[PDB]
Amino acid sequence: GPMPGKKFVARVAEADGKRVVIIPKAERAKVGIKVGDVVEVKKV
Amino acid sequence: GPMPGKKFVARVAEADGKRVVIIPKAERAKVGIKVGDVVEVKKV
């Protein structure tokens, strides 16, 4: 896959009562995310 | 609120067919996230 440490920008949303960052397929491809992967979320 | 640029570690999950990072209340308090806020997600 891609090298770790790539990032993308997103917005916190509500879904099923939870506060979530929804990750689109294209962003998963760009930064190499699969379900189960550890990520870091940083407030901007 | 807190200064921007704080971060926390999480795992990508599936919820309602979407790939999401679920943000618990305590992590929202630590990094100062509200619904609607812009964040950066980085693969580790």
Numbering used by the authors:
A (entry chain A), B (entry chain A): 1 to 44
The authors write:
The crystallographic analysis revealed that design-3 and design-4 adopted the homo-dimeric RIFT-fold. Thus, the short In/Del at the 1st loop position is the determinant for the fold transition between DZBB and RIFT. A single deletion in the DZBB sequence converted it into the RIFT fold. Design-2 seems to have a higher affinity for dsDNA than design-3, as dsDNA shifted even at lower concentrations of design-2.
Furthermore, the reconstructed OB fold could also be converted to the four-stranded SH3 fold by a simple circular permutation. Thus, these ancient β-barrel folds (DPBB, RIFT, OB, and SH3) could be readily interconverted by a few feasible mutations through the missing-link fold, DZBB, indicating their significantly close evolutionary relationships.
